[PDB]
Design a protein around this ligand. Structure first.
Ligand code: HEM
Ligand SMILES: O=C(O)c1[nH]c(C(=O)O)c(-c2c[nH]c3c(Cl)cccc23)c1-c1c[nH]c2c(Cl)cccc12
Length: 411
């Protein structure tokens, strides 16, 4: 061919921070790129166009279980190495890696807790949190927008939702990042799953203690809602409740964090727009839509073929692993003219940064509230947000994509 074998492993720092040119070349050669794996194994098909990505997350034929796909069984249900138990029992229990019917029942029991009406009555407390955070972060030496803002904001929001102390916000962040070392795009090199294993163990005990405490008080809070189901005839285990808690805690912030951080890098690289938001507050909602498609926090999601399927001009055999590049789709010229230009005026409801299909983002509404509000606080809270320079460090993560830390500078 012309361009080489494609995958998401082992990227250099500078391409992680700006992979769009990579997605562009490959996308221009072919909409799908097959990447074999060997002797009796499944190849991976990477989808780069918007239309194909939509089909992939739409198809009732692409599931989340590799072990269901292969008909094999010496195969893990979740992409977690068998030797690691705690880790593995917590990831198997994530709604995201679930297929109907189980997934349907769990999403339904959960979905009512993130309603537009609940989110609306939360906007005030989310605004108040963000402000107080910018206060502590301001009286500080070498402020880091991530650990000092983008990370604790959504953590405080989801933690109050679950029913756990805010005082643990830093402790929750640490373990979350440690656990995150298990996603498929990271190395397994030097200290692989090791840290993710210990992170899983701490969360299991931590949450186990919580659930064991339910029937003292009972407030409205996910933990109590869950344990209530189980005690009144609902079919779910502690391993189910525990994983669901970890799943929400992580799903509840790691994406919001990466979005907030990358939203700052984007605006600083587009001062005309950032200067627009500062002067015109109502533009925020529209801007959040663009910032979202321009540089989405989730660059890749995977599905598994449960029977043969034809995507693009390739036939994807039952058992294949399919990867939908959300970041590539969002910059597909076939659907977003001038994909590299930050244009807040283009029509919304097209960007797939929140996914699509039955696994669409459970807290999309909440997420969008934290983004609009959080961005606001930044725009109004840090006048020099777009001035001077900064220093950023991206993580070795192509799934949860975004800065590990983002430093700005003081007055
Ligand atoms: C701007 C921030 C956020 C972004 C960009 C985002 C993006 C996504 C994407 C792309 C998926 C699909 C994954 C797949 O198909 O494999 C997803 C799933 C999910 N997200 Fe969000 N998310 C965000 C915030 C949140 C928040 C704040 C919560 C907490 C309420 C949350 C909870 C979930 C859950 C539970 C799922 C799995 C749902 C299922 O499997 O049916 N997310 N998210
Ligand atoms: O590692 C992957 O390949 C992966 N793919 C997805 C996906 O959804 O397609 C995820 C994932 C888990 N939770 C998610 C949420 Cl809440 C949003 C978007 C993606 C994910 C993950 C993922 C994130 N963190 C993980 C950990 Cl810690 C273990 C195993 C998988 C993941």
């Amino acid at each position: 061919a012309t361009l080489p074998r494609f995958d998401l492993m082992g990227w250099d720092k500078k391409d992680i921070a700006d992979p769009y040119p990579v997605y562009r070349r490959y996308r221009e050669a072919a909409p799908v790129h097959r990447t074999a794996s060997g002797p009796g194994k499944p190849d991976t098909y990477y989808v780069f166009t918007y239309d194909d990505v939509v089909r992939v997350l739409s198809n009732r034929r692409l599931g989340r279980n590799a072990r269901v796909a292969s008909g094999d069984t010496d195969t893990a249900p979740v992409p977690i190495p068998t030797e690691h138990r705690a880790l593995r029992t917590v990831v198997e229990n994530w709604l995201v890696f679930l297929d109907p019917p189980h997934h349907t029942e769990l999403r339904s029991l959960l979905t009512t807790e993130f309603s537009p009406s609940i989110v609306t009555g939360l906007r005030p407390r989310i605004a108040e949190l963000a402000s107080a955070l910018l206060d502590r972060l301001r009286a500080q030496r070498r402020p880091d927008l991530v650990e000092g803002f983008a990370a604790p904001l959504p953590i405080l929001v989801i933690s109050a939702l679950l029913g756990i102390p805010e005082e643990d916000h830093t402790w929750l962040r640490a373990n979350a990042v440690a656990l995150q070392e298990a996603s498929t795009t990271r190395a397994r090199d030097g200290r692989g799953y090791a840290r993710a294993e210990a992170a899983s163990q701490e969360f299991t005990r931590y949450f186990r203690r919580e659930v064991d405490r339910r029937g003292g008080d009972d407030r409205d809070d996910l933990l109590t809602l869950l344990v209530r189901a189980r005690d009144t005839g609902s079919p779910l285990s502690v391993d189910g409740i525990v994983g669901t808690c970890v799943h929400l805690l992580t799903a509840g912030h790691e994406t919001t964090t990466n979005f907030l951080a990358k939203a700052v890098l984007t605006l600083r690289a587009h001062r005309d727009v950032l200067d627009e938001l500062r002067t015109t507050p109502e533009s925020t909602p529209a801007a959040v839509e663009e910032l979202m498609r321009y540089d989405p926090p989730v660059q890749a999601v995977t599905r598994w073929a449960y029977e043969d399927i034809r995507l693009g001009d390739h036939d994807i055999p039952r058992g294949s692993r399919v990867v939908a590049l959300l970041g590539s789709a969002n910059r597909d010229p076939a659907r977003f003219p001038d994909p590299d230009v930050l244009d807040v005026h283009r029509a919304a409801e097209r960007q797939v940064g929140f996914g699509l299909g039955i696994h669409y983002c459970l807290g999309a509404t909440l997420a969008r509230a934290e983004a609009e509000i959080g961005l606001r606080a930044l725009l109004d809270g840090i006048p020099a947000l777009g001035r001077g320079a900064h220093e950023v460090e991206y993580a070795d993560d192509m799934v949860f994509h975004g800065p590990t830390r983002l430093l700005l500078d003081l007055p």
